[PDB]
């Protein structure tokens, strides 16, 4: 994240870190949606342009973390993957359309003060909250800037959803209804964006109707990080929920 701030302890308890077993490194962000299901961006697992195509045993998921690099004894829980599920129409060839994937855990993870699931939006919550001007929150251990390098602990930044025509006009990539963009405009003064390594992490919003946090988006792509006139793009979770539900109901 660029131009964010350190997260408070237990601020984002659904935050999950996608971790490569060898070499041991951070791959992407993710989110806990139940005691055995983790949501992330499809491209964190499968991306042929960069010869990325991870199998279950190549990965680990670390839940309830704050520090990026330290092993958080008695706090974080590390889990192995049972099975990976990628959207059947995930478009890795062109514009990362339907950039979503689910990861089923070998064993349920125990909830604690630092580990707890976020809610997925129903049609009405999405309609009421996903509106230009309304701010969401993005968290991740991704790069701090485009050229310090990487954070010590989880970063957070609040960003306004942007009008769809503005999103469209800011890029050459073909935008779809399965995406939305967020961030401040050059004239608004405030800054901030997601960056490399933040992908797969959640863009959440706190419902003023029932005071619960909902995951509206998944960090997907951008053009640079925190550049003037450019906006970060996120997977539209509600629009792909029928697939999410189908995988969880079937599997």
């Amino acid at each position: 994240i660029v131009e964010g701030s350190d997260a408070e302890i237990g601020m984002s308890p659904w935050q999950v870190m996608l971790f490569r077993k060898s070499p041991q490194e951070l791959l992407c962000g993710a989110s806990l949606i139940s005691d055995r299901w983790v949501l992330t961006a499809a491209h964190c697992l499968l991306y042929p342009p960069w010869d990325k195509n991870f199998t279950e045993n190549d990965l680990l998921v670390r839940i309830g973390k704050h520090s990026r690099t330290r092993y958080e004894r008695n706090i974080e829980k590390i889990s192995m993957l049972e099975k990976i599920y990628i959207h059947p129409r995930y478009n890795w060839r062109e514009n990362l359309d339907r950039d979503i994937a689910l990861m089923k855990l070998k064993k349920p993870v125990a909830f604690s003060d630092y580990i707890h699931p976020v809610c997925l939006p129903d049609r009405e919550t999405a309609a009421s909250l996903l509106q230009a001007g309304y701010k969401g929150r993005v968290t991740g251990w991704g790069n701090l800037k485009e050229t310090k390098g990487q954070p010590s602990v989880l970063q957070v930044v609040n960003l306004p959803i942007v009008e769809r025509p503005v999103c469209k006009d800011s890029t050459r990539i073909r935008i779809t209804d399965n995406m939305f963009c967020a961030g401040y405009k050059p004239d608004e003064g405030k800054r901030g964006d997601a960056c490399e390594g933040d992908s797969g992490g959640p863009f959440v919003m706190k419902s003023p109707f029932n005071n619960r946090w909902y995951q509206m988006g998944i960090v997907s792509w951008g053009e640079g990080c925190d550049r003037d006139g450019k906006y970060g793009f996120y997977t539209h979770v509600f629009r792909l929920k029928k697939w999410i539900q189908k995988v969880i109901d079937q599997f």
């Binding site: 237990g10 601020m11 003060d113 699931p117 701010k135 969401g136 609040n158 946090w213």
Partner: peptide
């Protein structure tokens, strides 16, 4: 279920330092 309710924040009625910026945007 109990989704989206933080043990350290909503479940104790404590607010994080910036959540109010979100609420203030929701008109």
């Amino acid at each position: 279920a109990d989704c989206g309710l933080r043990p350290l924040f909503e479940k104790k009625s404590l607010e994080d330092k910036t959540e109010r910026e979100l609420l203030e945007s929701y008109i």
